[PDB]
Amino acid sequence: MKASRLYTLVLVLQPQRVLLGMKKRGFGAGRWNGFGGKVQEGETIEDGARRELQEESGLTVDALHKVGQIVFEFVGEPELMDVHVFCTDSIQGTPVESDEMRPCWFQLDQIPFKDMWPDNSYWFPLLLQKKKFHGYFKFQGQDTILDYTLREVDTV
Ligand SMILES: Nc1nc2c([nH]c(=O)n2[C@H]2C[C@H](O)[C@@H](COP(=O)(O)OP(=O)(O)OP(=O)(O)O)O2)c(=O)[nH]1
Ligand code: NA
Known part of the structure; x- marks a missing residue:
């Protein structure tokens, strides 16, 4: 494995x-996504999530709720991405656009699924229902899912 x-x-x-953020530069740009990135050495997962939210969106929150975990496998890439998904409903500043990311609000009847990663169509609806989930998705490139699993869980 x-x-x-x-x-x-x-x-x-x-x-x-x-709130979603559009990737502005590099390859893979043009998709809306949550805010996040690699966990760094010595920080807890939740603290890494708070850090990435601040660095990417400019928003500082004191805490986050963990709602899911999604493992991504890309054909031709040696590592899996183990992605810990967090939510919050409570913010106290404004999102900030950077050279790398443009934050934007979407109404919940206008979720821009066509411009989001394909896996989001499967697990985002669970998040909206206050459900917790575990998922796994294998991708060929950016657009094609070859295999995936998704399960609602009581505890993440
Ligand atoms: N399938 C899928 N892939 C995603 C989602 N979100 C997300 O970032 N990815 C993938 C696409 C990118 O190749 C990669 C982005 O991670 P990253 O390299 O930007 O993390 P980072 O900011 O810590 O890295 P860096 O820019 O500092 O080098 O993760 C998602 O919601 N679904
Ligand atoms: Na990132």
Whole structure:
């Protein structure tokens, strides 16, 4: 089995809208996603999620709720991505656009699934229902899922 690298993903989910960030530069740009990145040495997963939210979106929150975990495998890549998914409903500043990321609010009847990673269509609806989940997705490139598993869980 492949080794896996730890990542976080943060969704700011308010009662009527969700905050997403559009990748501005590099390869893979043009998709909306939660805020996140690699966990760094010595930090807890939750603290890495708070750090990435601040660095990417400019938002500082005191805490996050863990809602899921999703493992991504890419054909031709040696490591899995072990992505710990967090939520919060409570913010106290404004999102900030950078050269790398543009944050944007979407109403919850306008979730931009067509411009999100294909796996999001499967697990995002569970997140919206206050459910917790574990998932795994194998991708060929950016657009094609070859295999996936998804399960609702009581505890993550
Ligand atoms: N399938 C899927 N892949 C995702 C999602 N979100 C997400 O970042 N990815 C993948 C695509 C990118 O290749 C990779 C982004 O991680 P990253 O390399 O930007 O993390 P980072 O910011 O710590 O790295 P770096 O820019 O500092 O080098 O993760 C998602 O929601 N679904
Ligand atoms: Na990132």
